[PDB]
Design an enzyme around this catalytic site. Structure first.
Site, PDB file in Angstrom:
ATOM      1  N   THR A 110       0.854  -1.181   0.000  1.00 48.90           N
ATOM      2  CA  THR A 110       0.000   0.000   0.000  1.00 48.90           C
ATOM      3  C   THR A 110       0.895   1.237   0.000  1.00 48.90           C
ATOM      4  O   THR A 110       1.865   1.314   0.758  1.00 48.90           O
ATOM      5  CB  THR A 110      -0.978   0.036   1.218  1.00 48.90           C
ATOM      6  OG1 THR A 110      -1.417   1.377   1.488  1.00 48.90           O
ATOM      7  CG2 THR A 110      -0.368  -0.520   2.445  1.00 48.90           C
TER       8      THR A 110
ATOM      9  N   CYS B 272      -1.191   4.368  -7.833  1.00 47.62           N
ATOM     10  CA  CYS B 272      -1.980   3.158  -7.614  1.00 47.62           C
ATOM     11  C   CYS B 272      -2.514   2.566  -8.916  1.00 47.62           C
ATOM     12  O   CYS B 272      -2.501   3.207  -9.970  1.00 47.62           O
ATOM     13  CB  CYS B 272      -3.146   3.436  -6.670  1.00 47.62           C
ATOM     14  SG  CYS B 272      -4.385   4.558  -7.355  1.00 47.62           S
TER      15      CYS B 272
END
Lengths: 235, 231
Positions: free
Chosen positions: A83, A197
């Site tokens: 992440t 992302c």
């Protein structure tokens, strides 16, 4: 090969491509029925998110550091945090767990450096763009100048991510807007653009970007394979 | 919730659905942004295959037992082995690691018991159908009778799995053959049919079967969610 430790579940949907790509990379390089030696700790995202919501970053740091120590006790030899956002507390994990910490920005820094670039743009959540945990890492450790969009651009980019992209809405108006921001940062001297992302790369195909795209999640997984096989920087 | 420990990488492709299903099940039960607390140890499958080739069958058990102990050191509170056939060495794991071992056959035994059935049939690889590691666990722990097809049928079932299903080929000839085998097992008094692996479920939609279907891989994941939440 070395056993990699993954810190995941943030979200679980985005953990799966890490697991897929790391096994595929091992399967390619080693051949046969080889697959990746992986230890994965997947958190309850609700608890992590509740901490974020309340600005309780030290608590997320403790949580993730303890998960990393657990993976170490199970035999992990390196740590990958699956992440971008939670690299806000990378310093907590690095300092409390002695395993090599494979920073997401480090992997992309090596990729950018490998391409001979010194100046790039970063698109991600507003928090990721505005904080220094990603872009500060690039500048400090790789001497890469990292441009970000202006405040109005960052707010719209952020809105598109959470109101459309994360719900699966991929509109041309949003795709076009992203392409315009990339082009403006190109005119400001950016030589490449980092997609912070997966959802951004889903919206914007590379032929719609005037700049070379660095898929920072995919690069991170490739970096983990290299670590496991002691390649390049990890040699 | 309790943290589930997964033994996977056998194969890694088939481990992903366990992870997906347990996360989805937790989210469905708790709502919001809840996800599953999961520890996964994914092996290099090559090491498993080479233990068998080298005739070191005890080592296979030792590899998996030690993997479960490692997850236990990392905080796991129960163990799920993400593969039907590797339960051939489940006794190594269950006897060396004291965490509850949610045997793939235990999960499906609870499902069958929940449905009020006492007699079922099993379709799977020939090995899974003919050996005692799956069926024996079922009957000894739940007093459920588990029939298997006749010998020619088991041969064809097995061939279809390795020649077709594992290569992503799903033909109606094969699908019809399975459906007829199920009808025959119903004639012999099976009340439901267990699908031993996902590939069989990919071939035979549950509505094509004249018997209620227990997808053992999917139930295994649902059972883990139930364990994690005490239901």
């Amino acid at each position: 090969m070395k056993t990699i430790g993954l810190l995941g579940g943030m979200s679980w949907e985005s953990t799966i491509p890490y697991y897929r790509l790391i096994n595929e990379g091992i399967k390619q390089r080693l051949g046969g029925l080889h697959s990746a030696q992986v230890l994965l700790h997947s958190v309850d995202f609700h608890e992590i998110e509740e901490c974020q919501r309340r600005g309780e970053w030290d608590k997320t740091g403790d949580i993730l550091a303890e998960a990393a120590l657990g993976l170490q006790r199970a035999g992990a030899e390196g740590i990958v945090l699956c992440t971008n956002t939670m690299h806000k507390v990378a310093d907590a994990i690095e300092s409390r767990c002695t395993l090599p910490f494979l920073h997401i920005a480090d992997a992309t820094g090596r990729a950018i450096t490998g391409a001979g670039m010194t100046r790039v743009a970063l698109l991600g959540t507003r928090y990721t763009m505005e904080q220094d945990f990603y872009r500060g890492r690039l500048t400090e450790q790789f001497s890469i100048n990292c441009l970000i969009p202006e405040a109005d651009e960052r707010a719209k980019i952020n809105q598109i991510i959470f109101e459309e992209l994360c719900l699966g809405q991929f509109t041309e108006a949003s795709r076009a807007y992203y392409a315009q921001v990339i082009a403006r940062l190109a005119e400001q001297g950016a030589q490449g653009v980092i997609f912070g992302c997966t959802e951004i790369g889903l919206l914007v195909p590379e032929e719609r970007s005037v700049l070379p795209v660095f898929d920072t999640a995919a690069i991170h997984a490739e970096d983990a394979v290299a670590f496991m096989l002691s390649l390049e920087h990890h040699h």
